[PDB]
């Protein structure tokens with residue numbers, strides 16, 4: 035119920051995909067080790083149960099991206115796949131960047147904030163920020 039990926043293949047795919055869709059590679063570099071099992075030379079990612087793949091998506095959020103017109107494989111296929119899982123992380127980043135920039139005009143959508151949105155979901159993350167829960171330097 036896990037898939038193992040190598041550092042080399044993740045780095046290559048992230049470089050290609052980040053370029054294609056305009057999401058910084060450094061965001062992936064932050065998120066992937068946070069969400070997955072870091073092993074010598076790569077990662078293991080859970081592809082069974084409710085939260086799957088490098089992004090640790092649930093089915094409702096994966097399908098939510100597909101509802102937007104993002105071309106992704108089905109949840110159970112794409113989460114076990116390197117490229118699709120990376121596209122999904124990035125597509126979600128892009129939706130969240132738009133949401134954040136509309137809710138919080140004049141502020142930067144940082145990697146930290148992007149991950150807060152990824153992990154909590156946009157409705158909860160917006161409320162977390164509006165309620166003053168993120169500490170800033």
Ligand SMILES: CC(=O)N[C@@H]1[C@@H](O)[C@H](O[C@@H]2O[C@H](CO)[C@@H](O[C@@H]3O[C@H](CO)[C@@H](O[C@@H]4O[C@H](CO)[C@@H](O)[C@H](O)[C@H]4NC(C)=O)[C@H](O)[C@H]3NC(C)=O)[C@H](O)[C@H]2NC(C)=O)[C@@H](CO)O[C@H]1O
Pocket residue numbers: 085089090091092094095096097098099102126129151152153154155156157158
């Ligand atoms: C205990 C704990 O901490 N568990 C963590 C899980 O909560 C976490 O999974 C995340 O769970 C939240 C809550 O269910 C989920 O939130 C959803 O977020 C999406 C994406 O922003 C929202 O869907 C968007 O809604 C807007 C507004 O209607 C739409 O315009 C937009 O098109 C929608 N986009 C998509 C892509 O669907 C949902 O509304 C929101 N749902 C709720 C109930 O709040 C996250 O998406 C979950 N994260 C992921 C990556 O799936 C889990 C994550 O790994 O970690 C646990 O620890």
